[PDB]
Design a protein around this ligand. Sequence first.
Ligand code: 8SH
Ligand code: ZN
Ligand code: ZN
Ligand code: ZN
Length: 232
Amino acid sequence: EYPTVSEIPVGEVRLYQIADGVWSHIATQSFDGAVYPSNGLIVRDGDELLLIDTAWGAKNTAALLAEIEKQIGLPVTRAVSTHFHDDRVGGVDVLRAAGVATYASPSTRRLAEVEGNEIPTHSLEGLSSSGDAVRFGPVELFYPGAAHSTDNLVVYVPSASVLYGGCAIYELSRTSAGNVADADLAEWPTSIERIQQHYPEAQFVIPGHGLPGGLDLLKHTTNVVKAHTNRS
Ligand SMILES: CCOP(=O)(OCC)[C@@H](CS)CCCc1ccccc1
Ligand SMILES: [Zn+2]
Ligand SMILES: [Zn+2]
Ligand SMILES: [Zn+2]
């Protein structure tokens, strides 16, 4: 049902309807000689769409917009990137050219600039302290604290009980840590506990990469992070 790495050539994007007015988008990218799947989110709000994250590069993000037009047919008017890595902001220039208003926290914008990654134009205020939440159209944005990166945001869709954990949450199939070069390993389990405490009602949990599940993904991620922490 849910699209996998095997079934998506790099350059194509799949949409997966989760609920009324809520989709994930799934793309793949080559990196260091392997191929990785990647998720984002699409959320309807009236007669327009809110996009969560790019499809990991310009080419994929072009295909994303085309696939949205084909399968949904409503305009993307705002986008939020949930941290500064290229699987979240790579393609922001494509979005902007298409008239999308692109957003990220000041921390994400600052880190993207440092990294040399594309910089969302608008700033999300009210998210700089762990446990901060703000409304953004049909979703709530939440800063759980440092985890996969110091700037990582999570996204909740109240009407659908959909929790988008982004890359701070791992799919169950991943039993080893991925890119933790920018991670706060020491804080990551505590940040995951904040997510659990704030969104215990979540029914559909979407990781940044791979298969969705339920709130168990949180404990799973903590397990994997703690096991990496204990590198021997
Ligand atoms: C292997 C390179 O991972 P990235 O640093 O890609 C550069 C943008 C990471 C940013 S979150 C995305 C890929 C994470 C992943 C690792 C292993 C399996 C599935 C996804
Ligand atoms: Zn990342
Ligand atoms: Zn990622
Ligand atoms: Zn596990």
